[PDB]
Amino acid sequence: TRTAAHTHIKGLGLDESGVAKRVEGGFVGQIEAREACGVIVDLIKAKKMSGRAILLAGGPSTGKTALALAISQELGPKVPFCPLVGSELYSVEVKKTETLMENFRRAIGLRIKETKEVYEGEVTELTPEVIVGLKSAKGTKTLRLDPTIYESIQREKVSIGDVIYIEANTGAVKRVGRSDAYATEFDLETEEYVPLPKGEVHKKKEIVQDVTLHDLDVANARPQGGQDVISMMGQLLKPKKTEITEKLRQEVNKVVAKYIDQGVAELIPGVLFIDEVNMLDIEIFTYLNKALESNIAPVVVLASNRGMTTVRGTEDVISPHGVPPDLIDRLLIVRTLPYDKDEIRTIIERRATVERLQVESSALDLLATMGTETSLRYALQLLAPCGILAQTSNRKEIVVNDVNEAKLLFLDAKRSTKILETSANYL
């Protein structure tokens, strides 16, 4: 039961009428932010527009990433989701903009269905060109097959009387084992005999699996699932990630459009979330203007706890939240407010409860006072050491003396800075 700074957020807790309550879904306060977030939730649920931009901005310890996780959880698993940090964009194998596009194409999902054809049964004979003979529980069929999977079977050390499993669509070959009809041939044979399969050798099934566009693009450009010697021999030659031409994206778009027009698939827009976007370079920032103003780009959400700052990559322009006005114009802004004392106390007690800790009311008052004095994250971090300190004295509850002892043991930012200022050698 691992808990880490989250998992107490079970959703925005918004009413069906679009009015958020005070305490619900592991959330307290931020009524305006929650209402706007639910509005954006219904926006993406509409699945009619594309390339919309929302930025939420506020100081630290204001649950911005918590809000992003909340909207992601409220949307559910049907919609694709991919959290991101700004620093992850910079790579050495491919240019930054190409990685941005790669993450763009991974943020939209496609629900597809197809028929899987398989042939399974007992190995009867192997006549070279290649014809094979399969024996089932009741049926029996002979199959002519490509020499590639024949050689794969040879590599799979398939013997006589064995039972195998073949996927017709992909040519996947797998041997289940050998039939128990001829099993006790040896006293201590290493091969594990398995019972004969039941049913016809020919079988058809249906799947409903889901894929994203980036998966289709990388599958088309890079085949990395081969079985015969030529396949993996070729695919091991170029391990490095390369660029992806735009014409490949256009071809993939055409084929998925044909698939959905025929009526065996439908498109699912998704959400791309970039956290701490203040550090992004100017080139990526001006690339976002072109990337967003497109036809397929999904909605995007940004986070930045900044003010009058210079964006990285330049040295002149001072812009709010570290975002130049050009990207600001195509942006929606959500304001997050700092908390207050009673909300701090409620947060602390809720975090204690989700950590299954017993806390005495005076200890909660001390924790709230200290959190207002220094920060909420400080108290949230140090509550667990208080719990273990109480556990050392074999007490399941939290006492004020224990909290004071823990605060003595572990420092905060202001005390450490004050010690550093009066220090012998930059302690």
Partner 1 sequence: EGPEQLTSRNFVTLYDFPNAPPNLKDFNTNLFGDRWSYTNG
Partner 2 sequence: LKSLSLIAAHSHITGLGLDENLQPRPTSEGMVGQLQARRAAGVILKMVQNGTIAGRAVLVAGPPSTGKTALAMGVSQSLGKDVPFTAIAGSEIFSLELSKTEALTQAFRKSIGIKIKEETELIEGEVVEIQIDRSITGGHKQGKLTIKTTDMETIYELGNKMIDGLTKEKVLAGDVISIDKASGKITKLGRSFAFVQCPEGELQKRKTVVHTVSLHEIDVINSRTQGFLALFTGDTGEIRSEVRDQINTKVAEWKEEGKAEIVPGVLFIDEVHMLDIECFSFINRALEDEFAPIVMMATNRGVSKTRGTNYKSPHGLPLDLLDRSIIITTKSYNEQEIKTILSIRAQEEEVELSSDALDLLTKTGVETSLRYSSNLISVAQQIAMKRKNNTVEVEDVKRAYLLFLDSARSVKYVQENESQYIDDQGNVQISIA
Partner 3 sequence: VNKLRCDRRPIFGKNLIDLLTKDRRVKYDKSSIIDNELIKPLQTRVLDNRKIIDTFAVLTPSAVSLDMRKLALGLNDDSSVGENTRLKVMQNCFEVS
Ligand X SMILES: Nc1ncnc2c1ncn2[C@@H]1O[C@H](COP(=O)(O)OP(=O)(O)O)[C@@H](O)[C@H]1O
- Binding-site residues for ATP sit at 58-65
Instruction: Spell out, one character per residue from 381 to 420, where the chain touches partner 2: x when CB under 8 A holds, - when not.
Output: xx-xx--xx--x---------------xxxxxxxxxx-xx
* Residues in 281-340 that interact with Mg ion by CB under 5 A: none
| Contact stretch for partner 3 (CB under 8 A) within 65-73, 208-216, 310-318, 402-410 | 208-216
The residue type at 94: V
Which ranges of 269-324 does DSSP label H, i.e. alpha helix?
282-292
Number of residues that bind partner 1 (CB under 8 A): 14
Work out whether 317 is an interface residue with its own copies (CB under 8 A): no
Shortest distance, position 210 Cβ to partner 3, whole Å: 9
Paired tokens of 272: 């791309």
Work out whether 48 is an interface residue with partner 1 (CB under 8 A): no
- Among 46, 188, 207, 237, which residue interacts with its own copies (rule: CB under 8 A)? 237
If the CB atoms of residues 206 and 423 are measured against partner 2, the closer one turns out to be: 423
Closest CA to 73 of 88, 83, 61, 85: 83
User: Using alpha carbons only, how large is the chain's radius of gyration in Å?
Assistant: 30
* Residues in 54-83 that interact with partner 3 by CB under 8 A: none
Number of other CB atoms surrounding residue 123 within 10 Å? 20
For the beta sheet containing 265-268, the strands, ordered from the edge strand earlier in sequence to the opposite edge, are 210-212, 109-112, 265-268
* Residues in 10-69 that interact with partner 2 by CB under 8 A: 17-18, 32, 35-36, 39, 42-43, 46, 48-52, 54, 57, 59-61, 65
Structure-derived torsion over alpha carbons of residues 288, 291, 296, 301, reported in degrees to the nearest 10: 0
Closest CA to 244 of 351, 358, 98, 38: 98
Which ranges of 317-393 does DSSP label H, i.e. alpha helix?
325-329, 341-354, 361-373, 376-392
28: partner contacted, choices its own copies, ligand X, partner 1, none (Cβ within 5-8 A by kind):
ligand X
- Among 104, 119, 150, 378, which residue interacts with partner 1 (rule: CB under 8 A)? 150
* Residues in 302-321 that interact with ligand X by CB under 6 A: 305
Half-sphere exposure of residue 46, counting CA atoms within 13 Å on the CB side?
12
Closest CA to 386 of 358, 412, 362, 414: 358
| Contact stretch for partner 1 (CB under 8 A) within 83-91, 120-128, 184-192, 237-245 | 120-128
Positive/negative CA dihedral, 70, 76, 79, 81: positive
User: d(Cα 111, Cα 293) in Å, to the nearest integer?
Assistant: 25
- Among 17, 115, 209, 262, which residue interacts with partner 3 (rule: CB under 8 A)? 209
Question: Residue 157 has what DSSP assignment?
Answer: T
Work out whether 155 is an interface residue with partner 1 (CB under 8 A): yes
If the CB atoms of residues 114 and 146 are measured against partner 1, the closer one turns out to be: 146
Which residues are known binding-site members? 58-65
List of residues contacting partner 3 (CB under 8 A): 112, 114, 151, 170-171, 207, 209, 211-212, 215-216, 218-221, 223-235, 251, 255, 259
List of residues contacting ligand X (CB under 6 A): 5-6, 8-9, 26-30, 58, 60-66, 305, 347
List of residues contacting Mg ion (CB under 5 A): 64-65
